């Protein structure tokens, strides 16, 4: 028996990032946590751009991804973005935990299109680790550009991972698991190592015992 849950607090902290530079953009989702935005590493396929963060509070525009300070999660398609101090921070109400096998998750998505936003909760699905643990597999159909959307456990309502990649036939879907002591990484600066100008210049990346493409 698991407690019935309202997923609206998690929806209120989902943000839509769009890194645009010279007519080419990369749009995927993220999560708002204080002065930080947790999102996928493959958001930075291009360097020197303009980040557009769309939150429930407002829409923000940021100077140059090269100057941006980012903490990279080791061996995972995850990155912590340090927003400049002028941007208002979000709630620290989001709860991150390492996923547990045989624990069901639901993809929580916010629909920015409709005049009234919809806190969408997908159908439940089990999770299993893939190869070295860089990727975790779920059975929730995800459209393109839906990476960074939170995988939320139905037991305790914690974000256990963010969506990342899928196969070309769109039959298996892989998300990036939240690492151990990830909440310790958010509230303790001594564990954070910030880097600037990180970008993914390569077309093909070899991650998680797989060959992942950008398109």
């Amino acid at each position: 028996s698991h407690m019935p849950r309202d997923y609206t607090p998690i929806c209120d902290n989902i943000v839509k990032l769009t890194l645009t530079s010279d007519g080419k953009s990369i749009t995927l989702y993220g999560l708002q946590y204080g002065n930080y935005i947790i999102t996928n590493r493959h958001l930075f396929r291009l360097n020197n751009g303009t980040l557009t963060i769309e939150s429930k509070n407002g829409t923000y525009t940021i100077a140059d991804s090269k100057t941006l300070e980012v903490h990279l999660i080791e061996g995972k398609d995850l990155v912590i973005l340090k927003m400049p101090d002028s941007v208002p921070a979000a709630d620290t109400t989001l709860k991150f935990k390492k996923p547990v096998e045989n624990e069901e998750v639901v993809l929580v998505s916010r629909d920015f299109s409709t005049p009234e936003p919809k806190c969408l909760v997908s159908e439940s699905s089990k999770i299993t680790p893939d190869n070295d643990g860089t990727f975790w597999k779920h059975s929730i159909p995800t459209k393109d550009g839906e990476a960074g959307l939170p995988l939320v456990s139905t037991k305790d309502g914690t974000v256990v991972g963010l969506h990342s990649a899928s196969n070309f036939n769109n039959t298996n879907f892989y998300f990036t698991a939240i690492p151990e002591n990830f909440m310790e990484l958010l509230n303790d600066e001594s564990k954070r190592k910030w880097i600037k100008g990180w970008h993914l210049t390569s077309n093909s990346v070899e991650w998680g015992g797989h060959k992942v493409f950008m398109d």
Partner: peptide, 7 residues
């Protein structure tokens, strides 16, 4: 194993 593409 199987090839993937980012989303």
């Amino acid at each position: 194993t199987e090839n993937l593409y980012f989303q």
